[PDB]
Structures are given as structure tokens and as C-alpha cells.
């Protein structure tokens, strides 16, 4: 017999399946003998200590900044002072150097939130002695000469001695649940074009510059013995907190600046000498 | 990877860790490395296919610093902002990758001519763009798609787009993501270990195409290298919130 | 010619890469 | 772990590490990198014949060349670097019995342990970082900073306290085996004797007091925790 | 087939057999003979259909040395690298085959004209290309597709491609894969036993097509002949790993 | 299954004049290509033929040495599998330091030899090309080679046969004998990555014509 | 043990010996010397530190130089002689991986096995004897005849049948260890690298027929059944 098929359905034709998404469904055709065969990860596979998320990379400690602390530095003096924004290191100048892991990966997202962790390693010995105060300042910032303004915020006083390192969680205290990135979502300028006001006026967005600052002031002046150095360097590490969050994938704010060469055809393009 | 909590010997009191913002705005989490690598990157934007050649070669490798544009260098067919994509930035941290890649190819046509996409396994070379294989001047009688290799056809009149998944047909355990200098003439077998093969597009008549790339479902990365030395000038091309 | 092809003799080893002896590369 | 009161021989609360016919003591605490795995499963496929270990020879401590740190040294400066195993065969400690199996076998898998001992005085100060980069051939000049070192498996050395550092290095290579030796008859198409790089870098410059010493020294020691050799051949001189 | 372990009388000690690499890289096994024969081979690459003829004949037979190009001989419409495909090399080892073949035909058009593909069973001849059946000069009033034989239509505006499966409609138990000389004039009934019929493509107006062939699911090969005398010059058109 | 068929690869002579340590046989044992530096033409073995269809191979290779002799022939040879580094022709000791099997020729006139798979990679890529559009013996130049499909990773693995004890047959029989060298894939031989066949028929190749239209009717 | 009827590959009833990555077959029967013991108990006293074995390297078969037997050779004539281990380190098979541990270790105890393979035709005839003399230094020129060989542990080779011979050699030395290598810094008061001598001697001259071959060849192979090394040092070239 050859009976008629009365079954039918309305359809909406699309060219690709799950093109925008990182997961879900795919209409990908395997270039294989067996169409459902896949790569084996029985022996060779990702090692368990390797990061699985961008948040895992953000949990790696990275050296952000350094500053000197000497016996000449009078009490109340700012040893360190920065806007602690993981979007941009500077708002008013170019950056070039080794950016921290948490800053690198945060540069890929339009939004960030959660506490930021700092660690201050004092490159000293047992004969160095002094006290500093670390302060997280929000909304309103303190004068350079007014230590009392810094003392009125969220502070941690560290007595330098036998212990030469101190940890500091910077609280997330803002009017919004997340903060948008100060870097651009998309920047088509590739050849260091001389900027004008018309270029800025036709930008992708407006930079919401952070007023949150972290400062380090002298409490007790550094008083080392005559036999050792009078000045020491302090290494400032940074990473995302345990509840650090990222969202809204965008154009990367940072890009490699060292040993960048585009690929050529090997061996056609003059490899045979 | 070294977290560095090892070095953190201080055990004094600290402020609260609080509560995560993950899930508050939406459940669309975008932190997974695999999820970031599985969304597509534009390689070639409206590039010509010419039937005088064997075909347009695409080397099977993920986006990275290898395909990064630098102001002043010679003009290539590649997209200039490949190096500034999220997944390129991620791949700059991992020098090993294993598994399949997926290539979305769109032919700028509505004609009934078939355009063939042939997979070449790891042969040891690394090329891209239009090439005359063995420098001949005729390839219609000896097409690459009819030599024996695995091939798929696009028929633009039906569908101008396709998504093809290329296997990990190589000798090595891992594929090398990047080198310090991509144009350096070093040990020739090591030179070719940055790819796992090629994808060759051959037309009937002259026509343009666009090419995207992403990671497959069966895909892994390893050999964490950490962040490199970088530069930015994003600040300069935007106004602040105080005019 | 293309200067990326071959590394200068004073900084490199026989395998056309920076020598381990040459510390100043950084 | 805890110091004691002074006696005839000072504070006698030292620890030590004995491996084969070699012992290394330590006066203060040590920092140790995480024990992380190597590639396993490919060994039985890559080599049809069984692989061999020579623990008595390879798993002993062997000192290599001394490293000098000066006050002139800036952050990010390379104090020393090692392409392994190459540099432990034909550059450093060439007459070591650790190198004997590399003469005859052409292939191998190698997991290492590297101990670093510093000796700066109590009126000095500074920070040094040692890190490992797996499968580093033609990628030594990138991701090669102090920041990349802090991300990768590493150890940190304070130059005043003289804390010891132990870097545990697994075998993470894009092939099943690494080639041990180049030869005139062998191919030049594959770079042999390099599956990883070790970097010793200044994290914070060395500083000293008035009329103090302008330098101090660090000594590395190496050993194989798991050295499996494959493909027996006639013995040759190393490089 | 003779394995030849019969002749191996030696029973002395040997080195280890080791462990297989099958499954290590991927589960996509490509060793099965049937799997190799079931992936397509390009026969005709952009060949003309002319409505002045009955149609373009395709003889129902798998790819083999029968369709191999030799430098110097007369120019045919066939693809030159048919003889160098994996499955052609396999079919050169087996002189018997039984079952169905599958033909993927792509018409280079987007028009609303129907192009008919007619199956002819085993009649005893062996032809290919455009032919005027009984040397007439008019076939629109007497089309082959409207004579009674099994036929399928392609409508390029809907779909320019089709895949059709031709049956084993023959008198013989097996079809003969190849001969020593394909142009030799020997016993006429034996001459035609290398095919199981024909596939005839007839257009309305002048248009080009491309043709692929593969083995069906219901398909077997037998009568193992072993490897023939062969030649290669692949070495000459490639650099070594030592420059 | 085809690769498990024994096929005659090569032959060599062994005489009473051949002094100890002398290479009777010496070849790069690569199933991809027989030669890197010259054209091949002949009857290739089953395992080589089918390996020519794939871009990758792995696992041990089996050899069998059949000595075309009688009971009155006597001598000893040593078969050696050499990896990475190769031995000098005059230095037998270098061959002896590798993976060897010494065979005492006498009543038994055949010996089997499994060649171990010992490499830095789990599989080896084929030395032949994945795709070669040259059909009409085109005169090659450096530009043609520069625009090839890939780069030939030539194998340094060699199998050699040296004299241990000099052949000392009786005066009544022949002083020289031929040795047939068979080859096949091991029980765990593997193949992957279908490509253009490296080998193709060289004898009695004629393209098909229309029967009977094309002048069959005499 | 028992021959069979002729087939495609003749009388396929061969035996074989597999040791590490080396195989040796035999067409006819073999003669084997008695398994006899070495000195045990002194090892633990003589060396305070533990001794080491490298079976994969040392316990494999290694061929040495070929021996030619002629019709001119008379009874009692030395065809070859070997002072062991000296001659297996710096004379015969110098590039063998068996010799690798001798580069680094100064002392050792050594039990050997030596296989001999002859290849004379069926129209020849003759007898060769191989024997071992333990602790032979300054006593090689006495008790060195065919008669002394027949008394000491030995193997007998018929040159027509081509029967194989396996001599099992224990460690029988007047000291606890034998010294492996001489050195410029080391003393000349002790003769190193010699705990025994091996002699290959004609028992009955080689004979041949009319227009027959006037010579035939024998090939020795050696391996250590028990090689224990002691006293690790820096690696040196052998002699």
C-alpha cells in the first residue's frame, strides 16, 4: 500500500543553531567516519589543579604595585594611595607592564562585584620596626595631609616586626549590586589615532570613574637599627575575593605589548633559504 | 596554577566576605572557560575565494596572540581585533589544547554552485589563504575535495551558512597554542605543531566568504602560563562621568 | 631580509632561540 | 616548627631531607609547591617495550652552579635559567651519576624536585622567585615576568630569613616522551632535551646596611622523583 | 585471504606486543572497509547536461583502477584523482561486489526546471556521458524518464542536491569490479558484467552538474586479489624536516 | 586485517665472503614510504599499501626472515632495531647496544622478529603527502616544494642485519644464499586519518570508454 | 629436544633465550655449566651503604669480538682470552649500555653468563673448550692448559654440530669487592677490573674436506646475572 501522510507542522527556518550561545544545542557536522564519535580524554585530559573558570584565575595572587617606606617618612604621610578599580589602573595616562591575573580577566567583562583582597609583603628583616594603617575609603576621599579623615573609615593597623606580611579584605560598599567597567566595550582604534572631542563624543559609552581608594599611612615612624637599611620596599599583591563575580563579555581592555608577530604561510613565505 | 595562599602566612582578623552577586541579575553565568571558548570569533571578514587556486586554507588552531594585529606590520586577510576577544585573551594563558574546533563558514551568494569544505589532517605545514598546491595552473580536473579526504558541501541556494567540526587528527598529545615569534625559522617539525591540520574551501566561480571559529564540546585546555606583559589606551577614547 | 627569521649569534644557541646563558633578554 | 632555648650548639631544632646517599639540612622553615600530576596512560602505548627506573642514581640530590644576587639587580631580572634536562646533562654537574642513564636511553618521562638554599645575613633584605614553565621551547621570551612566575608553580625566597624552597615539577609535554640527546645521525627536525624551563628572578632587589655586604649567594639542588627511560641504544657522550 | 601464520613455523621468544593506540586519540575508528567505501568519491566535477541528447549516462560501478587517469591518454570527463582515493585503492583488492550504490548529484542551478534521474537495470552495455539513444535528433517527445523506468526528479529552486540509492538489478551473483584492459573487445556478455545498470540525468535546458558515488548500507565485497604493482613519486614534491 | 597479511618487502644475499660485523641488510623501517630520495616501482606489501591510505600509524611492526638454504648451510646473524640514533656501517658494537635478536641458522631456516614501537609520540604521521595534484610528472622546483601540503617528518628508526659468525657451507652446496624479508603490522597495529593514496597502479592502466559506441563494432 | 619432519621452514624446533631487550635462538642442543654459588655475607659488612642493581642495563645479552678458528690451530692454542670485567668495559663492546653503571660506581660484585655460538659446516670437524679461572691476576701463565680447562668450570663446543655453550661464572675473589676503574688520583697498589679470566682454547684442531673451508667463526655473548654496585662517585670515561 501507499497511503497518504496527513501529518504536518509549521516551522521557522534559521541558518544556524545556537550561534550566540556557549552551551545548549548545536547543529555541527563532524568531519569523521562515525558522526557521533568524539575525542578521547581517557588518558590525556585537563589536570585537576588547572583553573576551570575566570573566577579561579581571579583567585590567583598577583603583584599590583610597590612603594618605599623609610625612617624619614613622618607620621600621617601617604606611603600608598590609589583608586582601587579592577577595570583600569589609570584614567589619565597609558599603562604598560605586567597586569595582575584578576585585572586581566576582569578586563574581559563589562561588570564586576564582590570584595577585593590585598596582601602587603614588607621586604625587611627582624631589626626593622614600625606601624602603618591600611584604610578603605568610599564615596568621599581624604586630604593627603589629613590622616584623621583616613582613620574614620574601614581600617586595619599593622605592627611590623617578626611578621612581615598582612592580609586585607577590601569590602564591597556601593549604591549598586554590581559596578560597570571603566574600560570600553568596543574600541576600533588600532593605529594609535590622534584623538579629538568628536571621537570621544562618538564613543561606545561614558567612563563611570570610581572614587573608592585604598591608602597606607605611617602610624609609628620606621626606626630600624643603624646596622641595617633605613628604607624598605613593600610589595602590594591583589586578587578577587571568594565571592568575586564577573558578567557581560566584551572586547579585552588589555592586549599583548611584547613580541607580537602575525603568522605567515610556512614554508611558502621565504622559509627555504 | 599556584593560588598563592601558601605564601599568605598571616591569620589575623578580617572584614566580612559578604554574599556573591552571582545569580542576582540572571542565571546566565559567563565565568566558565569552556563556555567562553565555545562562542564564536570572526577570523575572516568578506574574503575572496578564487577557482584558479586549490582553495582558501584555514589552519586548525584557536584564536590567540598568534593572530594579533600590530600597527605597522604587513596587511593580512585576518580580522584585526582577534587578539582583543575574550577567548583569545584566555588562550594566551594556556599553551596546550586538545579536542575539536567548530568553524562557521558563510558564503556570500544564493547560487546553486556547490562550495566544498575539505578537512586535511596534521601534515606538518602551516598555511592560510589562497594557495596553488605544488604550483600548478589547473585544479578543476584534480580538486582537493575529490582526492579521498573527508569533505562537506555548501549549497547557498538552500543554505549559505554551515557549521563543521574538525577532529584532533594529530600525532601529539596536545596542540601548541602559540610561540614567541610566529615568523621564526626553527626546527621544522616543531614549527608545524601549532596546528592539527587544515580546512580548505574550494568554489566553482569567484565568490566571497566569512569565517568564524569556536571550541567544540569535546575540548580541553591546559599548561597554564599566567598573564603576559600588556598595554592599553582605552581611557583616551572616552569622556569621564564629570564631563 | 626578514629579521624575525634568524636570531643574532651573540644572544642565541644553535637551535635558533635565546641562550640560557644570555640573561639580558629580559 | 617551634624554636628552643640556646644550648652548646645554638638552637638545635633543624630539619633535613635524605634521598639515596645525599642529605640536606635546613635551619629555618621551608616552602613547598603543590604535588601535581603528570600525563599517565600514554607510556604503555608510546613504548611497546617496558620502561626502566634507576632510583639509586637519579633520585639523589645533586648541586648545580652557584647564583650570585647583588644590590644592583632590579625586579624582573633573570639571575639564572635552566632548560631541563639539557642543562643538567651537558652544562651543570656534568660528572654527576644522575646523568648516567641519559647516555644509553634515547627517550624518557621526568618528574623533578628542586631545592634552593639561600645565605644572606640578618641586616640584608630582598625577595627572589623561582618558577617553572612547562614545554617552553620557542616560548621563553613571552609570559616570562615576575607576574607570570607568581601565576605558574613557584617558590618564594626571603634573603634575610634564609627559608628553603622546594619546587615539585611534573612531566607536562605535548608528546609522550622527550628526546634525551641530539646526534649527528639523528634528525634535526625535533628539538631534544627540553620539556620545561626554570627561571630564577628578582622579585624585590637586595638591600644592605651601612658598610654591609653588597651581595649574597643561592645554591640550587635537583633530583628526579620519577625518571622512566625508554628506547635503549649504544652509549654516547652527552652533547 | 591467507594470513601466512601457517608458514611462520618459528616459536622462539619475542618482544612485547604492547597496547593499541585505537581509542586513545578519538573513538572515530576509520579501519572498517565498509565505513571507508560508504564515504563519497567525486566522479564528475562540473560537467555539462545538454537537452539535445537522451541524457548523461553514469555506469553503476564503484570507484577503482577502471576510472584511473594515466598521463598521455585521451581526455575524459572523469575526475583525475579517482584512482588515488582510499576506497578506489580498497576496491582494487576485491574483484566482486554486491548490493546498492548511492549517488549524490548536485545541479549547478536555482531554476524551477525539473531535472530527472532515471535508473536503468542491467541491459548488457557500458557507457558514460552524453549519448543520443538510437542516434535520434529529438528526445523531448520521447524522454527516457517517461518510458516506464524508475525515476526521481530534482527541483533546484527547492534543493539543487539529491542522494539516490540504485538497486542490484542484475542476473549475476556478483558484479565484476575491474578488468586488466577496460578498452579490450572480448566476449560481449562478459564485457558488460562490470556494471549492474545505468543512471541517466536529463535536463530541460543546458545546465552543469557534479556527481559523487559511495557504497550503500546493504553492500558487500569479496574475492580478495591482494595488492597490485604500483608506483609513487610523492617524496619529490615535499621538503624534509631537515630543510 | 589486510595489514596482518605477510608480504615480501625486500631481499638480500649472505655469502661466505661476508666478514663478521658486515651489514647484510640496512633500511629505515617506515611504512609510509620505502624511499625518501628516489622513486619506487614494484609490488608493495599489503600493510604498506593500506598504510598509504592513512595520515597516521602506530603499534609494533612484525618481520620474518626466510633463509633460502639447506641443512648444510650454517652461520649466525643478529637483527637489531635502532631508534633515534643510528649506528656506523663498520661499528657493529653500536647495533649490539640496541634491541637485538641473534639467530643461529641451521636446521631451522626462518626467524620471526617483532619491531617494538618506541617513539616520543603515541602515533607517527605519514611521510607521504595528504594531497598531490601533480598527475603529469611535472618538473619540480623549490616554489612547488614550498607550496606543498606538508613537511615530511622522515623516520630515523632503522632495522639492520649483521654477520655474527661467517657463513661456512660445505663445498658441495652454494657459497651464497638469498634471504627473503617479509613484513606485516603487529596485532596492535593502528591506522587513522584517511588521505589520498600514496601508491597507485603502474601496470596495465587503461581508462574506460563507451561500449559499444566507441568503435567496438569492427 | 626431539627433531621433527621437514616443512616450509625446515626443521622448526628451535629453542631461545630472552633476557631484557635481547633474544638469542639455537638450532641444536646446548651445553650448560653447573649453577654454583658466590661469596655471600661480606656484602653488608664491606659496604655500610646499600648496594644497587641495574638489571635492565646489565642483565641483557651483549655480543663481543668474533673468534676465527683455522686448520693451522693446534691443541692448547689460545683462540681468545678475556680479563673480566676490564676487557668488557674498555676493549670489547665499549658503547654497550651494560657498561654504564661502571662509569660512576668504584666497587662491585659480579656473576656472569657467557653464551658461545659456533658456525662450522657439516663436512668440518673439531673441538673447542672455554673455561673460567677465578682470581687469575699474576697466575694466568700457570694451570692454563686444556687439562686445567677440563678440570675448572667449562663448556665444550663441537665445530660440526654447532651445539651452543653457556658458562655460568660466580663471583669468587679474595676481597669483598673488585675495583671497577683505575684513575690518576687512585692508588696503583691494587690491580683493578680483574676478578677472573676466560680462556677459549683448541681441544682438537679444525679439519676440513678436499676443497673445503680452511676456517670457521665463533661469537661470544655476555650478560650479568647478578651485578651489585657499591661506592658512588663522579662519572669517568672507562680506561
CSV table of C-alpha atoms in Angstrom, one decimal, chain E:
chain,number,residue,atom,x,y,z
E,1,UNK,CA,42.9,-14.2,2.1
E,2,UNK,CA,45.8,-16.2,3.5
E,3,UNK,CA,47.2,-14.6,6.7
E,4,UNK,CA,50.5,-16.5,6.3
E,5,UNK,CA,50.9,-17.5,10.0
E,6,UNK,CA,50.7,-21.1,8.6
E,7,UNK,CA,54.2,-20.5,7.1
E,8,UNK,CA,55.6,-19.0,10.3
E,9,UNK,CA,57.0,-22.2,12.0
E,10,UNK,CA,59.4,-20.3,14.4
E,11,UNK,CA,58.2,-20.3,18.0
E,12,UNK,CA,61.1,-18.5,19.7
E,13,UNK,CA,60.7,-15.7,22.3
E,14,UNK,CA,59.8,-12.2,21.0
E,15,UNK,CA,59.4,-8.6,22.4
E,16,UNK,CA,56.1,-7.3,23.8
E,17,UNK,CA,53.1,-6.6,21.6
E,18,UNK,CA,52.3,-3.6,23.8
E,19,UNK,CA,48.9,-1.8,23.9
E,20,UNK,CA,46.9,-0.5,21.0
E,21,UNK,CA,46.6,3.3,20.2
E,22,UNK,CA,43.0,2.7,18.9
E,23,UNK,CA,40.6,4.8,21.1
E,24,UNK,CA,43.4,7.0,22.6
E,25,UNK,CA,43.1,10.0,20.3
E,26,UNK,CA,39.3,9.5,19.5
E,27,UNK,CA,36.6,6.8,19.2
E,28,UNK,CA,36.1,7.7,15.5
E,29,UNK,CA,37.5,4.4,14.1
E,30,UNK,CA,38.2,4.6,10.3
E,31,UNK,CA,39.6,1.0,9.8
E,32,UNK,CA,36.3,-0.7,8.7
E,33,UNK,CA,36.3,-1.4,5.0
E,34,UNK,CA,32.5,-0.8,4.7
E,35,UNK,CA,32.9,2.6,6.5
E,36,UNK,CA,35.6,3.7,4.0
E,37,UNK,CA,33.5,2.6,1.0
E,38,UNK,CA,30.4,4.5,2.4
E,39,UNK,CA,32.1,8.0,2.3
E,40,UNK,CA,31.7,9.7,-1.1
E,41,UNK,CA,34.1,10.0,-4.1
E,42,UNK,CA,33.9,12.8,-6.8
E,43,UNK,CA,33.4,11.2,-10.3
E,44,UNK,CA,32.4,14.3,-12.4
E,45,UNK,CA,33.3,17.8,-11.5
E,46,UNK,CA,31.1,20.5,-13.2
E,47,UNK,CA,30.1,18.5,-16.4
E,48,UNK,CA,27.5,19.8,-18.9
E,49,UNK,CA,24.0,18.4,-19.4
E,50,UNK,CA,22.6,19.0,-22.9
E,51,UNK,CA,18.9,18.6,-23.8
E,52,UNK,CA,19.7,17.6,-27.4
E,53,UNK,CA,20.8,14.2,-26.0
E,54,UNK,CA,18.8,11.5,-24.2
E,55,UNK,CA,20.8,12.3,-21.0
E,56,UNK,CA,24.2,12.0,-19.2
E,57,UNK,CA,24.8,8.3,-18.5
E,58,UNK,CA,26.5,7.1,-15.3
E,59,UNK,CA,27.5,3.4,-15.3
E,60,UNK,CA,26.6,1.8,-11.9
E,61,UNK,CA,30.0,0.6,-10.6
E,62,UNK,CA,32.3,1.7,-7.6
E,63,UNK,CA,35.5,3.7,-8.0
E,64,UNK,CA,38.6,1.7,-9.0
E,65,UNK,CA,41.6,1.4,-11.4
E,66,UNK,CA,38.9,1.3,-14.2
E,67,UNK,CA,38.5,5.1,-13.7
E,68,UNK,CA,42.2,5.8,-13.2
E,69,UNK,CA,43.9,8.6,-15.2
E,70,UNK,CA,47.2,8.0,-16.9
E,71,UNK,CA,49.4,10.9,-18.2
E,72,UNK,CA,49.3,10.9,-22.1
E,73,UNK,CA,45.9,9.0,-22.7
E,74,UNK,CA,42.8,10.7,-24.1
E,75,UNK,CA,41.0,13.3,-22.0
E,76,UNK,CA,37.8,12.0,-20.3
E,77,UNK,CA,35.1,13.8,-18.3
E,78,UNK,CA,36.1,11.8,-15.2
E,79,UNK,CA,38.0,13.2,-12.1
E,80,UNK,CA,41.7,12.5,-12.5
E,81,UNK,CA,42.4,11.5,-8.8
E,82,UNK,CA,39.6,8.8,-8.5
E,83,UNK,CA,42.3,6.1,-8.7
E,84,UNK,CA,44.2,7.6,-5.7
E,85,UNK,CA,41.2,7.7,-3.3
E,86,UNK,CA,41.2,5.3,-0.3
E,87,UNK,CA,38.1,3.4,-1.5
E,88,UNK,CA,39.4,3.0,-5.1
E,89,UNK,CA,42.6,1.5,-3.6
E,90,UNK,CA,40.4,-0.8,-1.5
E,91,UNK,CA,38.2,-1.8,-4.5
E,92,UNK,CA,41.4,-2.7,-6.4
E,93,UNK,CA,41.9,-5.6,-3.9
E,94,UNK,CA,38.3,-7.0,-4.3
E,95,UNK,CA,37.1,-8.1,-7.8
E,96,UNK,CA,33.5,-9.0,-6.6
E,97,UNK,CA,30.9,-6.6,-5.1
E,98,UNK,CA,27.1,-7.0,-4.4
E,99,UNK,CA,24.4,-4.6,-3.1
E,100,UNK,CA,23.4,-0.9,-3.7
E,101,UNK,CA,25.4,2.2,-4.5
E,102,UNK,CA,24.4,5.8,-3.5
E,103,UNK,CA,24.9,8.7,-6.0
E,104,UNK,CA,24.9,12.3,-4.7
E,105,UNK,CA,24.0,14.6,-7.7
E,106,UNK,CA,24.3,18.4,-7.4
E,107,UNK,CA,22.8,20.6,-10.2
E,108,UNK,CA,24.5,24.0,-10.6
E,109,UNK,CA,21.3,26.0,-10.8
E,110,UNK,CA,18.4,27.6,-8.7
E,111,UNK,CA,15.8,27.4,-11.5
E,112,UNK,CA,12.3,25.8,-11.3
E,113,UNK,CA,13.0,23.4,-14.2
E,114,UNK,CA,12.8,19.7,-13.1
E,115,UNK,CA,16.0,17.5,-13.7
E,116,UNK,CA,15.1,13.8,-13.8
E,117,UNK,CA,17.4,10.9,-12.7
E,118,UNK,CA,16.3,7.6,-14.3
E,119,UNK,CA,17.5,4.1,-13.2
E,120,UNK,CA,18.2,1.6,-16.0
E,121,UNK,CA,18.7,-2.1,-14.8
E,122,UNK,CA,21.5,-4.4,-16.2
E,123,UNK,CA,20.9,-4.4,-20.0
E,124,UNK,CA,24.5,-5.6,-21.0
E,125,UNK,CA,26.1,-2.3,-22.3
E,126,UNK,CA,28.6,0.0,-20.5
E,127,UNK,CA,28.5,3.7,-21.5
E,128,UNK,CA,29.1,7.1,-19.8
E,129,UNK,CA,28.5,10.8,-20.7
E,130,UNK,CA,26.0,12.4,-23.1
E,131,UNK,CA,24.5,10.0,-25.6
E,132,UNK,CA,21.8,10.0,-28.3
E,133,UNK,CA,20.0,6.6,-27.8
E,134,UNK,CA,19.4,5.0,-31.3
E,135,UNK,CA,21.0,8.2,-32.8
E,136,UNK,CA,17.8,10.4,-33.0
E,137,UNK,CA,17.8,14.2,-33.1
E,138,UNK,CA,14.7,14.7,-30.7
E,139,UNK,CA,14.1,13.4,-27.2
E,140,UNK,CA,11.6,15.9,-25.6
E,141,UNK,CA,8.6,13.9,-27.1
E,142,UNK,CA,10.2,10.5,-26.1
E,143,UNK,CA,12.0,11.1,-22.8
E,144,UNK,CA,13.8,8.2,-21.0
E,145,UNK,CA,12.3,9.3,-17.7
E,146,UNK,CA,8.7,8.9,-19.2
E,147,UNK,CA,9.3,5.4,-20.8
E,148,UNK,CA,8.3,3.4,-17.7
E,149,UNK,CA,11.6,3.0,-15.7
E,150,UNK,CA,12.0,4.1,-12.1
E,151,UNK,CA,12.7,7.9,-12.0
E,152,UNK,CA,13.3,10.7,-9.4
E,153,UNK,CA,13.2,14.5,-10.0
E,154,UNK,CA,15.5,17.3,-8.7
E,155,UNK,CA,13.9,20.8,-8.4
E,156,UNK,CA,17.0,23.1,-7.8
E,157,UNK,CA,14.8,26.0,-6.6
E,158,UNK,CA,13.8,23.8,-3.6
E,159,UNK,CA,17.1,21.7,-3.4
E,160,UNK,CA,19.9,21.5,-6.1
E,161,UNK,CA,21.3,18.3,-4.5
E,162,UNK,CA,19.9,14.8,-4.1
E,163,UNK,CA,21.1,11.3,-2.9
E,164,UNK,CA,19.6,8.3,-4.8
E,165,UNK,CA,20.2,4.6,-4.0
E,166,UNK,CA,20.4,2.3,-7.0
E,167,UNK,CA,19.5,-1.5,-6.5
E,168,UNK,CA,21.4,-4.6,-7.5
E,169,UNK,CA,19.1,-5.4,-10.5
E,170,UNK,CA,21.3,-7.9,-12.4
E,171,UNK,CA,21.4,-11.6,-13.4
E,172,UNK,CA,24.8,-12.3,-11.8
E,173,UNK,CA,25.5,-13.2,-8.2
E,174,UNK,CA,28.4,-10.7,-8.1
E,175,UNK,CA,29.3,-7.6,-10.2
E,176,UNK,CA,32.9,-7.6,-11.6
E,177,UNK,CA,34.9,-4.6,-10.1
E,178,UNK,CA,37.6,-4.3,-12.8
E,179,UNK,CA,39.4,-5.8,-15.8
E,180,UNK,CA,43.1,-5.8,-16.9
E,181,UNK,CA,42.2,-3.7,-20.0
E,182,UNK,CA,38.9,-1.7,-19.9
E,183,UNK,CA,39.0,-1.0,-23.7
E,184,UNK,CA,39.6,-4.6,-24.9
E,185,UNK,CA,37.0,-6.0,-27.3
E,186,UNK,CA,36.2,-9.5,-25.8
E,187,UNK,CA,33.1,-11.7,-25.3
E,188,UNK,CA,30.3,-9.1,-25.3
E,189,UNK,CA,28.1,-10.5,-22.5
E,190,UNK,CA,31.2,-10.8,-20.1
E,191,UNK,CA,32.2,-7.2,-21.1
E,192,UNK,CA,29.0,-5.8,-19.6
E,193,UNK,CA,29.2,-7.7,-16.3
E,194,UNK,CA,31.4,-4.9,-14.7
E,195,UNK,CA,28.1,-2.8,-14.3
E,196,UNK,CA,24.7,-3.5,-12.8
E,197,UNK,CA,22.9,-0.8,-14.9
E,198,UNK,CA,23.0,2.9,-15.5
E,199,UNK,CA,21.8,6.2,-14.0
E,200,UNK,CA,20.7,8.8,-16.6
E,201,UNK,CA,20.3,12.6,-15.9
E,202,UNK,CA,18.1,14.5,-18.3
E,203,UNK,CA,17.6,18.4,-18.1
E,204,UNK,CA,15.1,20.8,-19.7
E,205,UNK,CA,17.7,23.5,-20.6
E,206,UNK,CA,21.5,23.4,-20.7
E,207,UNK,CA,23.0,23.2,-17.2
E,208,UNK,CA,26.0,21.7,-15.3
E,209,UNK,CA,26.1,19.0,-12.6
E,210,UNK,CA,28.6,17.4,-10.2
E,211,UNK,CA,28.4,13.6,-9.2
E,212,UNK,CA,29.7,11.7,-6.2
E,213,UNK,CA,29.4,7.9,-5.5
E,214,UNK,CA,29.5,5.8,-2.4
E,215,UNK,CA,28.5,2.2,-1.2
E,216,UNK,CA,25.1,1.6,0.3
E,217,UNK,CA,24.3,0.2,3.7
E,218,UNK,CA,23.2,-3.1,2.0
E,219,UNK,CA,26.6,-3.7,0.4
E,220,UNK,CA,29.3,-6.4,0.4
E,221,UNK,CA,32.7,-7.0,-1.3
E,222,UNK,CA,34.6,-10.4,-1.8
E,223,UNK,CA,37.1,-12.2,-4.0
E,224,UNK,CA,40.3,-10.8,-2.4
E,225,UNK,CA,43.0,-10.3,-5.1
E,226,UNK,CA,45.9,-8.8,-2.9
E,227,UNK,CA,47.9,-5.7,-3.8
E,228,UNK,CA,49.0,-5.0,-7.4
E,229,UNK,CA,52.2,-3.5,-8.9
E,230,UNK,CA,52.2,0.3,-8.0
E,231,UNK,CA,54.4,3.4,-8.4
E,232,UNK,CA,54.8,6.7,-6.4
E,233,UNK,CA,56.7,10.0,-6.6
E,234,UNK,CA,55.3,11.8,-3.5
E,235,UNK,CA,58.8,12.2,-2.0
E,236,UNK,CA,59.9,14.6,-4.8
E,237,UNK,CA,57.1,17.3,-4.2
E,238,UNK,CA,57.9,18.0,-0.5
E,239,UNK,CA,60.8,19.2,1.8
E,240,UNK,CA,62.1,17.1,4.6
E,241,UNK,CA,62.2,18.0,8.3
E,242,UNK,CA,66.0,18.9,7.8
E,243,UNK,CA,65.3,21.7,5.4
